[PDB]
Structures are given as C-alpha cells and as structure tokens.
Amino acid sequence: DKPKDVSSITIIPKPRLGFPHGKGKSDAVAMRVNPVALTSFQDVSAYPDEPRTTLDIARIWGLRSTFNWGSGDEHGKELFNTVLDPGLRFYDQDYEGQITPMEYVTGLYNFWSGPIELRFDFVSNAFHTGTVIISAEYNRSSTNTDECQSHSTYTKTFHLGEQKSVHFTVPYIYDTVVRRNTASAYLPVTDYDKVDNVSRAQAMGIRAESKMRVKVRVVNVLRPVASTTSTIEVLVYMRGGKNYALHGLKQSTYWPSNSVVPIDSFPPDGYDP
Amino acid sequence: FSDGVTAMGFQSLDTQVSIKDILRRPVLLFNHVELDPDYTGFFIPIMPPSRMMQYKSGDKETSFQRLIGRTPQAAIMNLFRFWRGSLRYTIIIHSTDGHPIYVTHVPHTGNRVYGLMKVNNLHEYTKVPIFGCGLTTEMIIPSVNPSICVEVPFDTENNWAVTFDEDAQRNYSWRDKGDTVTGHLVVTPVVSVYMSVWVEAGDDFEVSNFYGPPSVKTNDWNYAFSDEH
Amino acid sequence: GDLVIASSEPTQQFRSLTNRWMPINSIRVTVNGKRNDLLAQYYIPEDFLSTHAKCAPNTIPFETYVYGKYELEMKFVANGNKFQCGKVIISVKFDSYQADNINTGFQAALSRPHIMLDLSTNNEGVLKIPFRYHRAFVRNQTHKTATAGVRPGKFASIYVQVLSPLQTGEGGANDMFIRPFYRYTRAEFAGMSYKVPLT
C-alpha cells in the first residue's frame, strides 16, 4: 500500500539556532563518527580552587594603589584621595599598568552594583603608631582643608599599633539600583587617531562620571621612634563585595599592550633558516 | 557597615556572570574574506581567540578582525592558559549559487597556519581535492542554506592546549610550537567567492591554569564627553 | 588517571631521598629594590638540578629516570631586625614555558597562588606546588642524543618579587637575606635508563 500523508504544519525558516543565546539549544554538527560522542573529562578535569563565575574573579585581592605617610604630615591632611570607580582609574589621562582583577572584569560589563571592599595593609613595624580615618562621601565632595565635613560622612577610624592591617566595606548608596560603566561600550578608533569635538560628538555613549570619593586623613600624626623609619608605605588592596553584581556584556575597556605580536603561518613564513 | 541585599535578578532573570556562558557567545574571526579555487583552500587554526589574535597599531595587516583582542571572550582567555574540549564554528557564504563549499576537519598534525594557502606548493588541486582524501567533512550549499554550525573535536595528545605564548613569531622548538592548536579546519570552494567565519565554545569546554590580569592600556576617556558639557 | 595509562610499568617513590628538606643559594634583599623587580626566579626542577643543589641526595633519582610527576613544598625564611619594614611576595606559575615575559607582575603574583612575607616579623612561607603540565609527564634531563623538540625540566616557575620596598631606620642595616628551602611531597618516576651527570 502507498497511502497519502495528510499531516502538515506552517513553518518559519531561520538560518541559525541559538546564535545570540549563550545557552538553550544548538544546531551543531559533530565532525566525528558517533554524533553523541563528547570530549571526556573523566581523568583530567577542572581544579577545585579555580573560579566558575566572573564574580569569583572579582573576589580576588588586587593592589589598587599605594601611598606614603610621614611624621611631618600634620593632622587633617588628606593622605589618600580618589574617585572609587570600578569602571576607570582616571577620567582625565592615559592609564598604563597592572589593573586589579575586579576592575579588569568589570571593564567587560556595562552595569555594576553592590559594596566594594578595601583592605589597607601598612608596611611598618610594631614601633610605628598613629591614628588615621577612612571616609566615604556621596552626592558631594568635601574641601581638603575642612576635615569636619569628611567626619560627617560614612567613616571608620583606625588606631595603628601591633595589627598592621584593617578591613573596610565601601557601601553602595545612589539614586539608581545599578550604576553603568563610564567608559564606552564600542570604540572603533584603534591606531591612536587625533580626536576633536566632531569625533567626540559621534560617541556611542556619554561618560556618566561619578562624584563619589574615598579619602584617608590623619587623625593623630605618626609619631615613630627614632630607631625606625619616619616615612612608611601603605598598600591599598581592593575587591568586589560578596553581594557584588555585574550585567550587560560589552567591548572590553582595557586591552593588553605589553609584548603583543601578530601571528603568521608556521612554517612557510621564513621559519626554516 | 551593612553588606546589604544583592541586585542579582532584580531587573531580569538573565544572569551572564558564568565564564563558559561568556565563552559560548560567538566572535567574528574573518569579515568578508575571499576564497581562491587556485589554492587548496582557506585554513583556520583550531584555537579560541586570545592575545595571539590581538591587532597592534602599525604592525603587518592580517586578514583577522582587529577588535578581537578587545572582545570579552579573548579577555577571559587572557586569564587562563589551559583549555580542553570541542569548539563550534559558524561559517557564512556570500552567495546564492549551487556550487557547494566543502568544509573538512584536520586533526593535530603539528603545523600552525591560516588564510588561503597551497599545500606542498603544487599548481593543481581539483583532480586531487583535500576534501576527498579520507578526512571528516561536511559540505555547504548556498542555494539551500549559506550558513553552517560545525563542531571541531579535541583530537590531540595533550591533557590541555596552550592558549597563548609570550611571543607569537618566536622560532622555538617546533614540537611545542604546535600546542597552540588542535589541528585545522579547511574550506574548499569551486569559484572565487566571499565568506565570513565565527567562533564559539562547545557544550563540552573547560579552561584552567589561571594567571590573572596582565599589563593593560586604555584611552577611552578621550573619546567621550562628560555630563558637564 | 593519566599516570597508569601513559606508563606501562609502575612508577617508583623514594620517600627517604625526596621528602627531606634542601636549602639553595640565598637571596639578598636590599633597600635599593623597587616594586615588581625580581629578587629571584626558578624553572623547577631544572634550577634544583643544574645551578642550585647539584650534589644534594634529593637529586639522586633524577640521573636514571626520564619521566616523572612532581608535587613540591617550598618553605622561605626571612630574617630582619624589628627597626625595618618591607613586603616580599612569592607566587608560582604552572607550565610557564614561553610565558615568563607576560603575567609576570605583582598583580599576577597576587592572583596566582602565593605567600606574603613581612621582613620585620620574620615569618616563614609554605608554597604547596602541585603538578599541572600540558602532558602526562615532564622530561627530566636533556641529552646530546635526545630530540631537540621538547624542552625538559620546566613544568613551573617560582617568582620572588618586591611587593613593597624595604625601608630601614637611622643607621640601620642596609639589607637583609632570605633563605629558600624545598622538598618533594609526591615524586613518581617512569622510564628507567642508564645514569648521566645532571646537566
């Protein structure tokens, strides 16, 4: 017998499946004998200390900056002063160095939120002593001469002694639930082209800068013994909080410039001497 | 101070924090490149994008896309040196014609090439095609569907593959030179015709041997206005 | 997993020869050091073979065998007076062949597994260094009849760097020293052959 097939359906043809989607379903064709055969990880697999998420990369301690503190530095003087942006280090000049992992990986996402931890380690002995404060200012900056304005903001005082470290949590209070990245989401200028207001007029986004500032002041001056150094150095470590968040994948802000060479066909391209 | 409440899942239930899910999003390798039937065919090295494929200001102009270095995927692959598992390529032909284009896998041999290239410097490849040698192949027909999604397997002797090297063009020992790839993919045309190639991770893919962020540079500040005029 | 398959013959351990400690040549730490400058760097186990600790009993089995797996520990000892202050970081980097120029920063040192030595408190540091190489085994020795395709004796690099420079007081000691120790916690050896001098 040869009966007819009465069943039918309306269909919409598409070129690919799950091409934008990172997960779901795939239209993949295996270049194997057995189409269900996959690469084995029975013997050799991932190591347990390795990160699974990009947030776990943002939970690694990285040296943000360092600064010196001396016995001549009077009370009220701003030792440290910056804009705590995980987006950019500077708004006004070129950067070239070894960026923190949390600022590196934040440079991939368009949006960020949550608290940002700072750990201040002090390069000293047990015979250095003196009091400093940690200030977190929102919606406004304080005058450098006026310490009293900074005392009103969210602060944490530390007494230098035997313990030469202090943990600190920079909170997250803004008008928005999430802050967006200051740097551009797409920059096609690669070869350091001379930029004018016409070129700035056709930017992909606008640099929505932040006026949030982290400052560290002298409460009581470093009064060391004569036997030890007068001018010590402070390590300022930084990572994302345990409730840190990221969203919206975009072009990377930072990009490697140290020891980069383009590839060439091995070994036709003059490899054989 | 208070740690507060997280903002994960507040806007929407589209979490993009996973490493593999970043790596599974595709990247453009070759944008509108020619195929010459005079040669054997276009060669693609089986490796994820990284600082290897990074363009520099005022170097030799390759056939690669320039902003590959500045993609998120290459940025993640500049944190890990080890990787294992299959990869998925999406190839698109710039044609409507019936003349098919054969895509043939090559396993790990040792060499590391790309672009249109002659094999063993001959002057004829139609009578002796690479796609009819014995290797695993799948053909594209532009008239039916000019795209494809092939999945190159991990066929090599190494527990992990080398992502990147400190110098790409350094003539060091040749056996360790070949650990940057797991073989090649071959694209063979009939006539001179344009195409584009995309790369993404397979379902089975893994990275390890974490190094952390290298020395970087930026100048994005210079190409935007502030919100104070 | 890869051990039993890649080696038809069973591998041997020499716990008496391997698990003991072994010093090497010292490290001078000056006040003249800047940030991200190398005090020391080692390509293990080659720099425990050729240069430092040639005639150690730990280097007895490395003559005869041509393959092996290597899990180490490295205890570092700092000794400076209480009127100094400085920070020294030491990290490890697995399969560092043709990757010494890049990810060599103190930032990468923080990111990779490391130890953090203060030079005033005079603390010690223990680097548990497992075996993570892109093959089953690493080749032990070079040879004049061997192939020149594979670079042996390098599955990891040690990096001793200034994290923050050493500072001293008035008329203080201008430098202090650090003595590195090492030992083998899991040393398995395959491919028995005739003995050779170590490099």
Binding site: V261, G270 | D167, Q169, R170, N171, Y172, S173 | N36, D37, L38, L39, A40, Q41, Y42, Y43, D47, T51, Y97, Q98, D100, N101, T104, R151, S157
Partner: peptide
C-alpha cells in the same frame, strides 16, 4: 629579517627563552 625570531644571546639560553639568572628583564 624579523627581529622577533630569536632572543639575543646576552639574555637567552640554548632553548631561546629568558634566562632565570637574568633579573632585569622586568
């Protein structure tokens, strides 16, 4: 030629990589 083919003799070894003895490469 390409200058990137070989590391110069002063800072290199027989394997054409940076010497572990040589510190000031950084």
């Amino acid at each position: 030629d390409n200058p990137h083919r070989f590391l110069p003799a002063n800072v290199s070894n027989r394997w054409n990589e940076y010497s572990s003895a040589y510190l000031p490469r950084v």
